């Protein structure tokens, strides 16, 4: 017997439609627009009626989740180069995104799953009443160049799946930092942030400075120095010094700084800690370890590259001395790749500054972002 349902494989698309655990194979004219394919799916699969019809769309999955894509409603199925036997998921367009708020709690926000990180950031900010979403960014919370997210790309293509909680993070503003001793709650907040940045290496400091900081830290945690209890071996130095500086010889320098605090109060040590951090040219600067080519040396030289609202700075990796600074005004153009980052200063100097780094895109976007702010104040 013959089959009246049969159509040549060349004139129709035979697609498996997946809705949760249900799968039905369905025949489509290949020029069918995605919106109309959803209508025909609602006419054949009862689980397609599980909500308002415009809440659902079509998603092309992939064994590599980073390659899954949402289909656009106005496009024809054959635009997506589908083949007989391919599967498309009939999926809710909005999905929950778990976000750590600025108070440390996690809030689940529904976002358009086809959109970029910037789009979902705007949705988040709209839900919690933030109008200036440009003061914020989303970051991962992995145990690190790995937590950065390109806001012009999607979470999906950057390897962030739906289970992952992201952090809403306020960008650094010097204007956020005005200190005070009458507000101990705020003073503690400023102290914890300055301390954590130094201990975790975000704020690179010299060995001598690291031990002065640790001396105030000792005053704050232990009270005035007491030679009976605060003796050799007492400190767990990993909690008082940046990782690069965790060396026994640091303890005696820390105890000297601690002793020099005398009977200074907890509040006043916090003030001094914050004041010392804010006094450094490295304070507030976003740093990247990059590899420099020195004239007359084959081995590349690691260097700290710092970006701020007004300049780019080269900082010695070991002493943290500021070696060179370029005003953002005197950069002609910049370029980033997955392996390098290069600056062109026009006629301000001969030769480009070109360094090896896997964070070039991060660096480029910081510079462009700060330059955009300077642009927006003049106009």
UniProtKB/Swiss-Prot annotation:
Location in the cell: Cell projection, Ruffle membrane; Cytoplasm, Cytoskeleton; Cell surface; Cell junction, Focal adhesion
Position of the signal peptide: none
Domain of life the protein comes from: Eukaryota
Residues covered by region (Interaction with LAYN): 255-379
FERM domain boundaries: 95-378
Subunit-structure text: Part of a complex composed of THSD1, PTK2/FAK1, TLN1 and VCL. Interacts with THSD1; this promotes interaction with PTK2/FAK1 and VCL. Interacts with NRAP and LAYN. Interacts with SYNM. Interacts with ITGB1; the interaction is prevented by competitive binding of ITGB1BP1. Binds with high affinity to VCL and with low affinity to integrins. Interacts with APBB1IP; this inhibits VCL binding. Interacts with PTK2/FAK1. Interacts with PIP5K1C. Interacts with F-actin. Interacts with SVEP1.
Function: High molecular weight cytoskeletal protein concentrated at regions of cell-matrix and cell-cell contacts. Involved in connections of major cytoskeletal structures to the plasma membrane. With KANK1 co-organize the assembly of cortical microtubule stabilizing complexes (CMSCs) positioned to control microtubule-actin crosstalk at focal adhesions (FAs) rims.
Domain remarks: Consists of an N-terminal FERM domain linked via a short unstructured region to a large flexible C-terminal rod which contains 13 amphipathic helical bundles (R1-R13). The rod begins with a five-helix bundle (R1) followed by three four-helix bundles (R2-R4). These are followed by a series of eight five-helix bundles (R5-R7 and R9-R13) in which the N- and C-termini are positioned at opposite ends of the bundle, creating a linear chain. The four-helix bundle R8 does not disrupt the chain because it is inserted into a loop in the R7 five-helix bundle.
Protein name, entry field: Talin-1
Species annotation: Mus musculus
Gene name per UniProt: Tln1
């Amino acid at each position: 017997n013959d089959n009246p349902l049969f159509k040549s494989a060349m004139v129709a698309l035979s697609l498996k439609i997946s809705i949760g655990n249900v799968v039905k194979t369905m025949q489509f004219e290949p020029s069918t627009m995605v919106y109309d394919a959803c209508r025909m799916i609602r006419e054949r699969i009862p689980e397609a009626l599980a909500g308002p019809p415009n809440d659902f769309g079509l998603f092309l999955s992939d064994d590599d989740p980073k390659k899954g894509i949402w289909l656009e409603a106005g496009k024809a199925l054959d635009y997506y180069m589908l083949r007989n036997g391919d599967t498309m998921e009939y999926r809710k367009k909005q999905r929950p995104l778990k976000i750590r708020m600025l108070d440390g709690t996690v809030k689940t926000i529904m976002v358009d799953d086809s959109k970029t990180v910037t789009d979902m950031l705007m949705t988040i900010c709209a839900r919690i009443g933030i109008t200036n979403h440009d003061e914020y960014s989303l970051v991962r919370e992995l145990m690190d160049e790995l937590n950065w997210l390109d806001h012009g790309r999607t979470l999906r293509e950057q390897g962030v799946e739906e289970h992952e909680t992201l952090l809403l993070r306020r960008k650094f503003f010097y204007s956020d930092q005005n200190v005070d001793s009458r507000d101990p709650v705020q003073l503690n907040l400023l102290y914890v942030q300055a301390r954590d940045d130094i201990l975790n290496g975000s704020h690179p400091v010299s060995f001598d400075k690291a031990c002065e900081f640790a001396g105030f830290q000792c005053q704050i945690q232990f009270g005035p120095h007491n030679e009976q209890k605060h003796k050799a071996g007492f400190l767990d130095l990993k909690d008082f010094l940046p990782k690069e500086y965790v060396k026994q010889k640091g303890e005696r320098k820390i105890f000297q700084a601690h002793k020099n605090c005398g009977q200074m109060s907890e509040i006043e040590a916090k003030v001094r800690y914050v004041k010392l951090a804010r006094s450094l040219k490295t304070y507030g600067v976003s740093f990247f370890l990059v590899k420099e080519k020195m004239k007359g040396k084959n081995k590349l030289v690691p260097r700290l590259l710092g970006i701020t609202k007004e300049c780019v700075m080269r900082v010695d990796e070991k002493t943290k001395e500021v070696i060179q600074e370029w005003s953002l005004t005197n950069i002609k153009r910049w370029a980033a790749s997955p392996k390098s980052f290069t600056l062109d200063f026009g006629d301000y100097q001969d030769g480009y500054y070109s360094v090896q780094t896997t964070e070039g895109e991060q660096i480029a976007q910081l510079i462009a972002g700060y330059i955009r702010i300077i642009l927006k104040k003049k106009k």
